[PDB]
Amino acid sequence: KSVLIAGPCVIESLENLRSIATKLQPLANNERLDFYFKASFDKANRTSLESYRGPGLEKGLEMLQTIKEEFGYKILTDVHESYQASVAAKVADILQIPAFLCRQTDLIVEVSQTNAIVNIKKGQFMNPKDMQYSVLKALKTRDKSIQSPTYETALKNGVWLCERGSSFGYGNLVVDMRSLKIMREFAPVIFDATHSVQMPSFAPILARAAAAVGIDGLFAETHVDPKNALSDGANMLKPDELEQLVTDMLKIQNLF
Amino acid sequence: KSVLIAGPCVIESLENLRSIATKLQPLANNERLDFYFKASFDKANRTSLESYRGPGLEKGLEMLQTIKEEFGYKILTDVHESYQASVAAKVADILQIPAFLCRQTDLIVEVSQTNAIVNIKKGQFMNPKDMQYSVLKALKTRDKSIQSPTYETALKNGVWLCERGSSFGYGNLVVDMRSLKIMREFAPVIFDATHSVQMPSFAPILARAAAAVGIDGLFAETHVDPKNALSDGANMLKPDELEQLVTDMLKIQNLF
Ligand SMILES: [Zn+2]
Write down the domain spans for chain A. Answer: 1-256
Q: How was this structure determined?
A: X-ray
Ligand 1 center to A40 CA (angstroms): 8
B1 C-beta neighbours (distance < 10 Å), count: 11
Question: Is residue B49 within 8 Å of residue A137, measured between CB atoms?
Answer: yes
Resolution (A): 1.6
Facing A124 at nearest CB: one of B45, B125, B140: B125
Cβ–Cβ of A125/B45 closer than 8 Å? no
Facing A133 at nearest CB: one of B48, B105, B127: B48
Chain B contact set for A125 (CB, 8 A): 123-125, 167
Please give the helix or strand (H or E) that residue B160 lies within, else none: strand B159-163
**Residue B133 touches chain A, beta carbons under 8 Å:** yes
Q: Which residues, including other chains, have CB under 8 Å from residue B130's CB and lie 6 or more apart?
A: none
State which amino acid sits at residue A169: G
Chain A contact set for B81 (CB, 8 A): 81-82
Ligand 1 center to A193 CA (angstroms): 10
Q: What gap in Å lies between CA B186 and CA B150, rounded to an integer?
A: 4
Cβ–Cβ of A109/B137 closer than 8 Å? no
> Which of B35, B92, B29 has its CA nearest to residue B65?
B92
Specify the CATH superfamily of domain B1-256. Aldolase class I (3.20.20.70)
Question: Is residue A17 within 8 Å of residue A229, measured between CB atoms?
Answer: no
**Residue B104 touches chain A, beta carbons under 8 Å:** yes
Instruction: Return the C-alpha torsion angle A115, A121, A123, A128, nearest 10.
Output: 100
Q: What gap in Å lies between CA B138 and CA B110, rounded to an integer?
A: 9
Identify residues after which chain A is interrupted (C–N over 2.5 A). 200
Q: What gap in Å lies between CA B121 and CA B166, rounded to an integer?
A: 11
Chain B contact set for A173 (CB, 8 A): none
Facing B45 at nearest CB: one of A104, A141, A166: A104
Ligand 1 center to B134 CA (angstroms): 20
Q: Where are the beta strands (DSSP E) in chain B?
A: 2-7, 33-38, 74-78, 94-97, 117-121, 159-163, 166-167, 173-174, 189-192, 217-221
Question: Is residue B222 within 8 Å of residue B24, measured between CB atoms?
Answer: yes
Alpha carbon separation from B13 to A113, A188, B40, B55, B66 (Å, rounded): 30, 41, 11, 8, 12
Distance from B76 to chain A by nearest Cα, in Å?
Answer: 21
Q: What gap in Å lies between CA B87 and CA B91, rounded to an integer?
A: 8
Task: Tell me the β-bridge partners of A192.
Answer: A219
- The pair phi, psi for residue B152, each rounded to 5°, is -60, -45
